[PDB]
């Protein structure tokens, strides 16, 4: 690179860069398949599988409400 | 208006606005089911939505397959304290991506700041880059710069449909590469007499890229980011400028172009960190110094504009703000000249208007 200090204008210009310009957006849609996890239940108390299953059911139910919240926030991104 | 004062944040809002509009289209029942029907017999799909946008569609089925083919038959009779250690460990390994996708979308209210490995693996990142509407030179560059692709992309949550978590990732298409590019920095050049200041400041700071016989100007320098000799630029807040405007970098007074400046009587001390050094505008009211990390403070700087190369000193301080000089090495020129300020409140005007 070459940097030039312009004493007549208290400015610099640095040259020698090669561009990488974002000209567009490519959309990748994902379907993450969790399976019929909400129809499974552990009736025998504390357990490693019970803990993992409750994390999974909990994460599913939380994303549903996160999604709803997003629909109001997307209104504000478009209609402030 | 004043371009540098309005341009930042613009390219970001355009990306979000563009993504949300695509997300709205994907959330329709006809498009969700079309995408779901595309992926019935395969893990990967390409398709054009009703609104015209091309999407690559990817199914991630490890967890669903573990749940269908191992966990369910093993938890017949609704008992989970079974002595199957590999089942519990496999369950924990197979659901961690999902749990990480939920945390990233929950913490960010449905729009992530980047592309995490849980939204997109390296394998999947390479697959999508391969499908981008660009040529081999760009794809080769992008595959060698996946960290930058992740940093400039983002995800948007589509919704939950049954057991199916649907989301979209915007990846940056770097469609134009290796054209000449340069960055302009500036600070207030100000003359002093009778306690009175006569200031000048350039109002065309930022990044410039000569692309396809036409020069483009990116006023918000945060829309561009360097890796070595490469500068990665969002083009959403780009603006064409005439070829002659580069003459402001050798003769601010040229008649071939009305170089944009701001001239006033209110100096603002500041430090403009440049790639190979720093610009330092130091005036009455604040103190400025440069230093090395081994021997303490080098010297106090004189008032006015000083150009400190990143080899003259490792640090520059203005008042109590401390800036780290770059460590890059390069050709450093001082183009000598009488400061135009010493020849003397307008804003973003041609320089010949500052003289009257
Ligand atoms: C699940 O079952 C299938 C066959 O039904 C088997 O190939 C696979 O190894 C099992 N997975 C685990 C993690 O045990
Ligand atoms: C800069 O341009 C002006 C007018 O175009 C001219 O008077 C002046 O001599 C030029 N200076 C240099 C160094 O070219």
């Amino acid at each position: 690179l070459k940097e030039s200090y312009l004493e007549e204008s208290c400015s610099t210009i640095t040259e020698g860069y090669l561009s990488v310009l974002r000209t567009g957006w490519y959309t990748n849609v994902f379907t993450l398949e969790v399976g019929d996890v909400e129809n499974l239940t552990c009736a025998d108390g504390p357990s490693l599988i019970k803990t993992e299953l409750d994390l999974t059911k909990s994460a599913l139910r939380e994303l549903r409400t996160v999604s709803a919240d997003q629909l109001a926030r997307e209104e504000q991104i478009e209609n402030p | 208006f004043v371009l540098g004062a309005i341009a930042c944040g613009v390219a970001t809002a355009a990306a979000v606005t563009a993504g949300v509009a695509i997300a709205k289209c994907i959330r329709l029942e006809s498009e969700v089911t079309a995408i779901k029907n595309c992926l019935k017999k395969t893990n990967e799909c390409v398709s054009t939505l009703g609104c015209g946008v091309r999407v690559l569609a990817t199914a991630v089925r490890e967890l669903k397959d573990f749940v269908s083919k191992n966990l369910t038959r093993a938890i017949n009779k609704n008992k989970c304290d079974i002595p199957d250690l590999k089942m519990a460990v496999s369950f924990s390994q197979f659901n961690r991506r999902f749990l990480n996708v939920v945390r990233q979308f929950s913490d960010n209210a449905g729009i992530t700041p980047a592309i995490s490995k849980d939204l997109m693996t390296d394998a999947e990142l390479a697959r999508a880059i391969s499908n981008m509407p660009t040529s081999a030179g760009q794809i080769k560059l992008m595959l060698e710069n996946r960290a930058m692709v992740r940093r400039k992309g983002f995800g948007i949550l589509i919704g939950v449909y049954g057991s199916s978590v649907i989301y979209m990732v915007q990846l940056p298409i770097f469609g134009v590469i290796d054209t000449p590019c340069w960055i302009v920095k500036a600070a207030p050049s100000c003359s002093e007499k009778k306690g009175n200041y006569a200031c000048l400041l350039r109002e065309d700071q930022g990044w410039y890229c000569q692309n396809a016989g036409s020069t483009v100007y990116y006023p918000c320098e945060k829309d561009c980011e360097t890796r070595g000799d490469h500068v990665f630029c969002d083009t959403a807040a780009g603006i064409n400028v005439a070829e002659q405007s580069k003459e402001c970098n050798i003769n601010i007074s040229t008649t071939n172009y009305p170089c944009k400046v701001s001239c006033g009587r209110h100096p603002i001390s500041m430090v403009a960190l440049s790639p190979l050094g720093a610009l330092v505008a130091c005036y009455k009211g604040v103190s400025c110094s440069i230093g090395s990390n081994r021997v303490g403070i080098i010297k106090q700087l004189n008032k006015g504009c000083s150009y400190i190369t990143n080899q003259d000193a490792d640090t520059v301080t203005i008042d109590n703000t401390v800036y780290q000089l770059s460590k890059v090495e390069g050709e450093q020129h001082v183009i000598k000249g009488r400061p135009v300020s010493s020849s003397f409140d307008q804003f973003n005007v041609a320089l010949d208007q500052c003289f009257e």
Side-chain angles (χ1 to χ4, degrees), chain B residues 41-328:
Chain B
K41 65 207 55 212
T42 178
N43 295 332
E44 207 185 57
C45 254
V46 281
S47 159
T48 307
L49 318 171
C51 48
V53 162
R54 274 288 263 200
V55 307
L56 173 78
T58 307
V60 181
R61 299 194 166 102
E62 286 79 45
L63 188 55
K64 182 259 158 191
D65 280 337
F66 174 74
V67 168
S68 277
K69 318 186 319 171
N70 312 110
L71 181 59
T72 299
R73 186 145 263 231
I75 298 325
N76 279 176
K77 199 46 65 53
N78 287 269
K79 292 185 171 189
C80 294
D81 194 13
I82 51 152
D84 193 342
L85 182 62
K86 70 196 75 192
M87 189 75 45
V89 164
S90 290
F91 197 6
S92 185
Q93 316 174 124
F94 275 136
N95 71 354
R96 209 117 189 267
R97 179 173 185 183
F98 167 63
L99 298 179
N100 284 349
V101 166
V102 163
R103 277 279 73 62
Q104 289 158 18
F105 272 131
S106 183
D107 290 6
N108 299 290
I111 302 174
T112 73
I115 311 168
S116 82
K117 283 203 197 342
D118 314 277
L119 293 185
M120 227 167 157
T121 66
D122 290 326
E124 294 160 348
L125 200 79
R127 303 284 293 186
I129 293 179
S130 285
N131 271 285
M132 280 172 172
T134 193
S135 304
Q138 299 90 311
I139 286 159
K140 173 169 152 51
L141 188 147
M142 265 170 316
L143 294 170
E144 285 168 1
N145 284 277
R146 281 166 329 226
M148 200 47 71
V149 176
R150 295 188 172 282
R151 170 179 173 90
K152 295 309 171 174
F154 65 103
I156 305 183
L157 172 63
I158 299 299
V160 183
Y161 303 80
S163 312
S164 302
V165 173
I166 299 191
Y167 65 97
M168 70 177 267
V169 180
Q170 296 289 81
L171 290 96
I173 308 166
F174 293 115
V176 162
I177 58 144
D178 300 349
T179 59
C181 221
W182 56 97
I183 181 174
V184 174
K185 302 299 288 263
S189 179
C190 213
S191 171
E192 193 276 332
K193 176 101 182 83
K194 255 43 170 293
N196 297 332
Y197 279 110
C199 289
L200 185 147
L201 173 69
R202 289 188 63 189
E203 293 286 343
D204 54 4
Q205 292 174 249
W207 278 98
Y208 295 79
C209 252
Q210 173 69 23
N211 163 32
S214 169
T215 310
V216 184
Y217 170 42
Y218 308 89
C220 186
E221 97 161 17
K222 232 65 169 72
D223 289 348
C224 293
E225 171 175 1
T226 50
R227 290 301 181 263
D229 284 345
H230 278 110
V231 55
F232 291 76
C233 285
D234 201 308
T235 69
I239 287 172
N240 292 330
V241 292
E243 236 276 347
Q244 305 82 45
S245 70
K246 205 175 180 260
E247 272 152 47
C248 310
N249 300 307
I250 196 42
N251 184 4
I252 199 47
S253 312
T254 173
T255 49
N256 297 334
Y257 192 85
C259 297
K260 294 299 176 292
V261 294
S262 274
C263 40
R265 310 161 252 211
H266 296 307
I268 287 201
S269 300
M270 63 147 71
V271 159
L273 220 63
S274 73
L276 298 179
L279 274 171
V280 173
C282 206
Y283 299 108
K284 182 289 151 192
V286 321
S287 48
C288 316
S289 89
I290 65 161
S292 283
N293 279 106
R294 298 195 216 125
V295 282
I297 178 167
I298 298 263
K299 272 302 167 140
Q300 304 291 328
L301 280 172
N302 294 345
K303 299 298 181 167
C305 271
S306 309
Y307 175 65
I308 316 303
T309 78
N310 63 10
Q311 323 296 167
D312 283 80
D314 310 69
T315 189
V316 58
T317 79
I318 165 158
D319 275 356
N320 280 331
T321 317
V322 183
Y323 304 85
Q324 227 57 29
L325 269 295
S326 266
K327 287 65 183 65
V328 197

Side-chain angles (χ1 to χ4, degrees), chain A residues 3 5 7 10 18-20 22 26-35 41-44 47 62 70 74, chain B residues 27 56 58 80-81 103 106 157 164-165 167 169-171 178-179 231 233 235 274 276 305 307 331 333 337:
Chain A
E3 186 157 291
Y5 164 58
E7 174 197 333
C10 198
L18 303 153
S19 61
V20 193
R22 191 204 61 69
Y26 194 74
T27 296
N28 199 337
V29 171
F30 283 82
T31 60
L32 199 159
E33 300 304 294
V34 165
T41 36
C42 303
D44 62 341
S47 157
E62 175 182 18
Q70 186 186 218
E74 273 181 8
Chain B
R27 277 196 206 93
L56 173 78
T58 307
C80 294
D81 194 13
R103 277 279 73 62
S106 183
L157 172 63
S164 302
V165 173
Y167 65 97
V169 180
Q170 296 289 81
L171 290 96
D178 300 349
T179 59
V231 55
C233 285
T235 69
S274 73
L276 298 179
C305 271
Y307 175 65
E331 254 187 88
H333 295 221

